[model samples]
Structure formats: structure tokens, C-alpha cells
Target: QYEVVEDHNISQLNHLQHLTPKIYVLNVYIIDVEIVYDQEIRIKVVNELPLVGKYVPPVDILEVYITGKEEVQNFLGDEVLTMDIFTPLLNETSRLRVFQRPDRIIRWSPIECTIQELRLQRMFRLR
Candidate 1:
């Protein structure tokens, strides 16, 4: 099953030092994995929790642990399937605008992936 183990540390995308000092953890889950080329692979994940009145601007993805990481490392990484959230408001949501690196520097890392279309899931509108 595609799953994500909560680790509460999206070190890869945590760069909101100017926001608040409170610590909050978001839930992330694995959607699926896809093979792009003979040597390229893509991993899909999501944050299904409601962001209704919680998260502030400069929305950050905390942490995510893919259940089958080893299997994917046996291939690749990146790409998250975001559900009902304010993420859609960001025009360039599909692109990897910024993320943290291993050295604690917030720079445009070579790590690139896609952000799928926002899912109009049950959390936001009643279905």
C-alpha cells in the first residue's frame, strides 16, 4: 500500500523562519509512484488534512516519510499530490519554487518535481 509515516520534519521545504515561532506538524501520505524514463522515476505524495483556518501564508509542508522509500530509492523522489487546501491559490503551484537543503540554506536546489492539480476533496466542500 502507498503510505507515509509521519516524521514531522519536512526539512526539504521548511524555510518560513519569518513566520511564527510555533511548531506545527502536517500529515503527509503517499499516493503512487511513476516511472518517467529508463533511469528517471517520480514519487507522489499528499497532505490530506484540512487547512481551513490553520496554516498562515507561505504555506509549508512539514515532513513526510514514504512507506516504500527503499523501493523508490531503488529509483527516485519528489512530486506531491496536494488535496483541498489554499495551495491552489499559488499560481505556480506545479513548480518547485523553493525548498531547504541538507546544509540549512534555503536555495533553489536541483531537486525538482511536479505538484499535481489541487483535488477538490471532502475536507473543503461537502460532497
Candidate 2:
């Protein structure tokens, strides 16, 4: 809400209007992660869409959610992929906690959100 008025904000609104929707093709993974924030944790991931495919347009820039304790999850992606994760919990649990769920694109809100500066690069590097 704070950014209802910001410099160079609407620079993206009518941007996609003149462009055609192209096929989204790609796959990604998480090799490492770390979170350190007092209020909210934010991470930025970038993807440069190659000017390869016919009629392809330029896509760049991204950004922004939260949940419960156990049920807390950050879903990202239109690819909606599911994979098993073998990593330690925030507690730094010695026993590896295994979990599986859709991990990229816009499986949930925020990342899928087109409005607001919270927009991600629209790839899969969601945090």
C-alpha cells in the first residue's frame, strides 16, 4: 500500500498489452538458501529470456508472502512442479526433514501477482 505512488511505477502496466503471450518453458532447482530478516525476508532471482523463439518478447524484473508455523509454505510458479526436499528445518535440525510440494512459479499468490512492486523476475527463483 505504501507504494501506491512511486517513481517509474506504471512503466509496466501497458507494457505487456502490445506483446503476445508466448509459451513458458523451463525448469529450475534450489542448491542452497538462507534467510535473515527481522520483519520480512526477501530474495531476488533473475532470468534473462533469450531473444530466441519467434515473436518472443523481453521479460525482466521480479519481487514478494507468509503463512503459519507447520503449515507455512511459499508456493511459486505456473509450472506447478513438486519435488522432495531434504534439508534441515530453521531449527537447524540435525535430522534431515524431508518434504515435498510444488516449488516454483506461481503455485500460490504474490509471485503470481502482477500488480505491486512485490513482483518477482517472474521466473522460478522465488523465496
Candidate 3:
């Protein structure tokens, strides 16, 4: 069964900081993961929560978790997912994890990397 463990306010996105301190908040809803399986998968994010400004549709997301199994061949198909949080500054890290329900195991993506790098928009950070 899928569940939402954390649904932090988008306002927290504004807390992101880089070399300089600037304040800007982008409305976002960040669903932790997008699972792809042999069967058709459907997911959605509704604007049921109070937002800071006008409602914006969530864009599809495909964040691959690359630190465990060599890649399962049984998985297939892909879909778009959106997040509900302001994009953090260029060098901010967003923590996320993935679980293998059948085995009851949990794994997290590497830390010390910025969202931009994770998205391939930039390179990884040194600190």
C-alpha cells in the first residue's frame, strides 16, 4: 500500500539558501517517488491543500534512484508526476528514499548533491 509520510508546506522551499541569501518561494507538491512496474500505473496530485498563490498543475517527474540493485528487468512503462514545493536554490539537497515492499527494505538517495545536479541541470556539489 502506498502512503504519504511527509507533506511539508511549500513555504519551506523558501528556506533554501546558497552563497547569497535570497528569499523566493515556488508553489510545489513533491511526491517522494514514481514507481514503474510491468502493469499500468496511475498516480495523481490534487490541489486539496491551501496554496500560497494561484494553483499550478504538477509537472511529470522521473527521478531515478541509482544506488541498489543492478536494475530489475520486470519493471516497464513510465508516467509523469509533479511535486508541490518551491525549487530550492541551486545547491540545496532534497532527501528521498525508496522501499522494496516485498522485501521490506528501504534505501535512500545519496546526500550532498543539489537538486539541479540530481536533475542533470548542473554538476554535483563538493560540500
Question: TM-score winner among the candidates?
Answer: 1
Q: What's the residue-level lDDT of 117 in candidate 2?
A: 17
Q: What pairs collide in candidate 3?
A: 28-84, 28-85, 29-83, 29-84, 29-85, 30-83, 30-84, 60-81, 61-81
Residues 29-113, model 1: lDDT tens digits: 4334444333333333334433567642233333222223443343132533233222433222121222223334433221222
The better-scoring model by TM-score among 2 and 3 is 2
Residue range 12-125, candidate 3, lDDT tens digits: 322223222222222223334334442222222221332588554432322223332223221211322223212332223333332222223321222222233344422333
Q: What do the candidate models score in CA lDDT, each in turn?
A: 0.32, 0.23, 0.29
lDDT of 3 at 43: 23
- Note the clash tally of each candidate: 2, 15, 9
- Which parts of model 1 have CA positions greater than 4 angstroms off? 1-6, 9-12, 16-27, 47-127
Error at 9, model 3, angstroms = 18
lDDT of 2: 0.23
